[PDB]
Specification:
The PDB classes it as rna binding protein. The entry lists the keywords ythdc1, inhibitor, complex, reader, RNA binding protein. The chain is globular. With 138 residues, the chain is α+β, with helices and mostly antiparallel strands. It contains 3 helices and 10 strands, in the order E-H-E-H-E-E-E-E-E-E-E-E-H. The chain has one domain: ph1033 like domains (ph1033 like fold, Roll). The protein starts with a strand and ends in a 6-residue tail after the last helix.
Length: 138
């Protein structure tokens, strides 16, 4: 049982990010849903670090605070807040990729963290390092 896991959540645009921070909620692809769910049960704390596609920044990070339901919403569709789950935002300020240039993910072929498909798990050590960069920010 890993105690903390870390994932990158890519957002298509900046509006979507803004809603996530104001409302404390998120949603993601079904492939990512099963992965995030068993992370949520396995690990004490699941951190979600967010990045708007082609924006050159991490727009802060959050903890995963709730599970991702289905069942009654399986023959329905993504409609009716299907897939919405609760996120607790920890730091909201943008972090430019440059500050994390030195951080590589051995779980994504020692590629840099700023390069990650949506849902990508970071190996916890670099994960813990990526989160710490925010302390430089006010």
């Amino acid at each position: 049982n890993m105690p903390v896991r870390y994932f990158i959540m890519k957002s298509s645009n900046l509006r979507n990010l803004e809603i996530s921070q104001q409302k404390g909620i998120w949603s993601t692809t079904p492939s990512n849903e099963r992965k995030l769910n068993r992370a949520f049960w396995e690990s004490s704390i699941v951190y979600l670090v967010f990045s708007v596609q082609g924006s050159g920044h991490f727009q802060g990070f959050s903890r995963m605070s709730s599970e991702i339901g289905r069942e009654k919403s399986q023959d329905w569709g993504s409609a009716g807040l299907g897939g919405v789950f609760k996120v607790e935002w920890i730091r909201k300020e943008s972090l430019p990729f440059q500050f994390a240039h030195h951080l590589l993910n051995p779980w994504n072929d020692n590629k840099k963290v700023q390069i990650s498909r949506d849902g990508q798990e970071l190996e916890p050590l670099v994960g813990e390092q990526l989160l710490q960069l925010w302390e430089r920010l006010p």
